[PDB]
Amino acid sequence: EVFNATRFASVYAWNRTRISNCVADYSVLYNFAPFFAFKCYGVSPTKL
Amino acid sequence: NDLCFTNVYADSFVIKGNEVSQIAPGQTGNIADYNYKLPDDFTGCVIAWNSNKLDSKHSGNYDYWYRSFRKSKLKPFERDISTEIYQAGNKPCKGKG
Ligand SMILES: *[C@@H]1O[C@H](CO)[C@@H](O)[C@H](O)[C@H]1NC(C)=O
Numbered sequence: 001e002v003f004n005a006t007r008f009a010s011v012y013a014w015n016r017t018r019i020s021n022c023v024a025d026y027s028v029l030y031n032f033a034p035f036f037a038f039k040c041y042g043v044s045p046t047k048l
Numbered sequence: 049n050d051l052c053f054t055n056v057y058a059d060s061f062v063i064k065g066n067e068v069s070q071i072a073p074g075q076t077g078n079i080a081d082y083n084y085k086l087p088d089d090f091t092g093c094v095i096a097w098n099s100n101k102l103d104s105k106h107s108g109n110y111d112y113w114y115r116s117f118r119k120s121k122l123k124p125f126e127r128d129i130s131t132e133i134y135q136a137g138n139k140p141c142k143g144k145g
Pocket residue numbers: 003004005006032
């Protein structure tokens with residue numbers, strides 16, 4: 001969803017979802033976007 | 049102009065304007081991750097000058113190339129010349145589209 005939406009909020013009202021009770025494999029996040037900037041400020045994508 | 053070097057390596061390539069900002073020891077970006085990666089402990093100089101007179105002509109010129117799809121990151125000073133279609137999902141697909 002978070003990426004196969006269309007109406008991503010304007011920045012004045014940033015929509016915020018909560019992700020819980022699930023298993024995260026960020027390869028879907030990778031293949032859902034021809035990335036331009038993946039500057040992580042938390043955990044490295046390798047160890048994500 | 050006051051130093052000596054065991055050996056000197058000169059790597060030359062044309063990239064775009066933002067990519068000059070991208071080229072630096074350990075930066076993020078499909079160039080600094082899949083196309084060229086300098087070592088973290090880099091001891092050298094990066095030269096960049098504008099060339100709109102040799103890489104441009106009327107009706108366009110698409111001669112140059114760059115990689116956005118690699119199976120992993122690029123190790124420092126390591127070339128990855130190859131034409132292999134990136135896998136998506138689980139298909140052993142070999143082709144465009
Ligand atoms: C989301 O994924 C589905 C299945 O891959 C695809 O049909 C759809 O176009 C995608 N939506 C967006 C906005 O990427």
